Specification:
monomeric, transferase, 7-stranded mixed β-sheet, binds S-adenosylmethionine, alpha/beta, globular, 8 helices, methyltransferase, two-stranded parallel ribbon, about 260 residues, Tick-borne encephalitis virus methyltransferase
């Protein structure tokens, strides 16, 4: 058993009120009052982030932790926050965004955020069975939280195998992907294998809630995987009993309009 396993069991034990006080204490959080309202309407003229995923990818890019260039692929785009972020970047030539949709899953929000015309959105697609194609940048933000850590580990292992197939198709491609449950032994093993072949390492986003152990793997970064995960596990374990609340920051506004 690991520190992250204990955190998970610790987190499941929380009452509602303690879950609400724990999940956001000490985290950065975009103020989405306006963006939520634009989404609640049908507002198609919108450059504000369509989700909290946009700021996370921007945090990674702006730290030098993630490279976005050329033909981008967003695997599991949901509303498309990463897709719109990537499409706004001058180095990016095109985004091919895929998400499964269906009952209880988000579909792309259709909006005029800068560079939107460069995005090819495609719902009803299972990226785990899709054939990989050419890509310069491989993004994948897949990983649905679940009280059962074995399930989180299995979902995370499917993502890493997804990235192995896309990297086998595009060996020189950069990649950034969500690792929902990095503390699981099957996941540590798969990341270790991935790191031996493709390089990279794991980093923690300050926008991630304490309710999730998610870390992001990127080929732009380095580091001992086991140490990275334990460092995060210890921090999350510490945060219990603390309740200073989040630090609010403005949401990203990418502007609107087309790109060439
Ligand atoms: C949490 S969202 C990522 C958030 C997104 N990056 C954003 O900024 O809005 C991950 C998406 O992947 C989708 N997904 C899960 N499994 C999938 C699969 N097998 N094939 C395609 N999409 C999948 C989920 O429905 C979900 O909408």
């Amino acid at each position: 058993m690991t520190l992250g396993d204990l955190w998970k069991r610790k987190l499941n034990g929380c009452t509602k009120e303690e879950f609400f006080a724990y999940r956001r204490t000490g985290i950065l959080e975009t103020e989405r009052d306006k963006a939520r309202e634009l989404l609640r309407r049908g507002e198609t003229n919108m450059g504000l982030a369509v989700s909290r995923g946009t700021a996370k990818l921007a945090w990674l890019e702006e730290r030098g932790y993630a490279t976005l260039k050329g033909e981008v692929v967003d695997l599991g785009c949901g509303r498309g926050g990463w897709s719109y972020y990537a499409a706004s970047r001058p180095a990016v030539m095109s985004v091919k965004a895929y998400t499964i949709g269906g009952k209880g899953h988000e579909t792309p929000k259709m909006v005029t955020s800068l560079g939107w015309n460069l995005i090819k959105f495609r719902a009803g697609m299972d990226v785990f069975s899709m054939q990989p194609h050419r890509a310069d940048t491989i993004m994948c933000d897949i990983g649905e939280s679940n009280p059962d850590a074995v399930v989180e580990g299995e979902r995370t292992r499917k993502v890493i195998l997804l990235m192995e197939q896309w990297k086998n198709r595009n060996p020189t491609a950069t990649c950034v992907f969500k690792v929902l449950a990095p503390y699981r032994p099957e996941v540590i093993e798969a990341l270790h294998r991935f790191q031996l072949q493709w390089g990279g390492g794991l980093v923690r986003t300050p926008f991630s809630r304490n309710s999730t152990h998610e870390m992001y793997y990127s080929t732009a970064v380095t580091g001992n995987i086991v140490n990275s995960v334990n460092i995060q596990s210890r921090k999350l374990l510490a945060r219990f009993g603390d309740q200073r609340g989040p630090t609010r920051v403005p949401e990203l506004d990418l502007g609107v309009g087309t790109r060439g």
